[PDB]
């Protein structure tokens, strides 16, 4: 059924863009505890079952299969956005080609942001640099494994959830940075990516999102679509 494979976000009580600076030290710790628990279990359908067979090559995707992988993440992400009251974001062929290139771009052997990738593809695809800074990309590494470069459609949307999750509930020790740049206002496109060589115990997701502001001012902005999903409130509130 389609509650029971719902994949939205559970939010805890007292959850914000900011929680980490408006709540104490003990309702931080309670809310974060909270929501890992909330969101541990990967919500799991009779499709989803069937996505454990459809194999992905991460350097291979075809343009349907890299739309649907930001669609499928945007929508998780704009579910919360548009719970806190933030800007809903768009998917375009735009926001697909900057996020492949910077995952084409990017040091297959490192673990942190190549902003040198970064910014090279920012330059490529219209976007405004910022030398030796990454304002573009979440990255998520070892959520995954490529065997022979592919992975399944299962396990990909398994990793993207626990990565959103853990960047929303579970982001203190890397000072909420992702937390406030994935609920960042004004925002209005994503992009996902997928890099690592064919046999890898590090493959990454790369999260690209942005506003229309980070473009240089010659620069053609594609409007896209809004990825937009039914909420479970709204689902249980029709029932
Ligand atoms: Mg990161």
Do not use: C
């Not at 710790?29 to 079952?49: G, Q, R």
């Not at 115990?201 to 942005?210: A, E, F, Q, R, V």
């Amino acid at each position: 059924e389609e509650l029971k494979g719902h994949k939205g976000i559970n939010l805890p009580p007292k959850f914000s863009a900011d929680y980490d600076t408006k709540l104490s030290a003990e309702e931080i710790a309670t809310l974060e505890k909270t929501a890992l628990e909330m969101n541990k279990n990967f919500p799991t359908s009779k499709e989803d079952e069937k996505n454990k067979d459809v194999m992905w090559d991460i350097q291979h995707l075809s343009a349907d299969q890299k739309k649907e992988l930001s669609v499928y993440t945007t929508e998780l992400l704009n579910d919360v956005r548009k719970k806190l009251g933030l800007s809903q974001l768009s998917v375009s062929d735009q926001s697909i080609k900057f996020a492949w290139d910077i995952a084409k771009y990017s040091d297959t052997g490192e673990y942190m942001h190549d902003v040198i990738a970064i910014n090279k593809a920012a330059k490529e695809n219209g976007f405004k640099e910022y030398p030796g800074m990454n304002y573009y990309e979440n990255l998520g590494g070892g959520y995954y494994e490529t065997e022979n470069g592919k992975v399944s459609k299962y396990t990909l949307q398994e990793s993207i959830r626990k990565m959103l999750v853990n960047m929303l509930f579970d982001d203190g020790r890397l000072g909420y940075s992702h937390l406030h740049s994935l609920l960042q206002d004004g925002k209005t496109a994503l992009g996902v990516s997928l890099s690592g060589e064919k046999n890898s115990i590090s493959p990454k997701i790369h999260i690209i999102s942005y506003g229309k502001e980070k473009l240089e001012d010659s620069s053609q902005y594609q409007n896209g679509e809004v990825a937009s999903m039914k909420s479970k409130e709204e689902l249980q509130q029709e029932i």
